[PDB]
Amino acid sequence: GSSGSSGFTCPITKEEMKKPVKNKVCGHTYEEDAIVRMIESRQKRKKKAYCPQIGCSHTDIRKSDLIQDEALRRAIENHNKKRHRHSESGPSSG
């Protein structure tokens, strides 16, 4: 599986990811708010959470099989540290 050499985009929200969550069933990775808003948006519509990753065949995802991937977490931070978007925040308490 390969999408981008440098960067992480959620196939659902279609935006940068900050909290990558890996599944125990399949293994793919998605955004927290994404996998959280999806499962809640599906159930309410009498639906099921399926691998949103365009290309997968699986269609069985459970909130219980959702974990916080560290290997990916520290990775994303490695790019964010670069600081090339805002670079203008002087908070009194950090």
CA distance 75 to 94: 22
Size of the site for Zn ion (CB under 5 A): 6
Strand 66-68 and strand 29-31: pairing? unpaired
Question: At which residue do the structure tokens 């203008």 appear?
Answer: 88
Annotated binding-site residue? 51: yes
Chain residues 59-78 in contact with Zn ion, contact rule CB under 5 A: none
10 labelled binding-site residue:
no
Among 28, 30, 38, 61, binds Zn ion (CB under 5 A): 28
- Distance, in Å, from the CA atom of 87 to the CA atom of 36, rounded to the nearest integer, reads 30
Contact assessment for residue 40 and residue 89, using Cβ atoms and an 8 Å cutoff: no
The reply to whether 56 sits in an annotated binding site is yes
Looking up tokens 């991937």 gives 69
Q: Is 39 in the site for Zn ion (CB under 5 A)?
A: no
Binding of residue 26 to Zn ion (CB under 5 A): yes
Query: Is 57 or 87 the residue whose CB approaches Zn ion more closely?
Result: 57
Q: Which residues are annotated as a binding site?
A: 26, 28, 51, 56
The residues that touch Zn ion, with contacts defined as CB under 5 A, are 26, 28, 51, 53, 56, 58
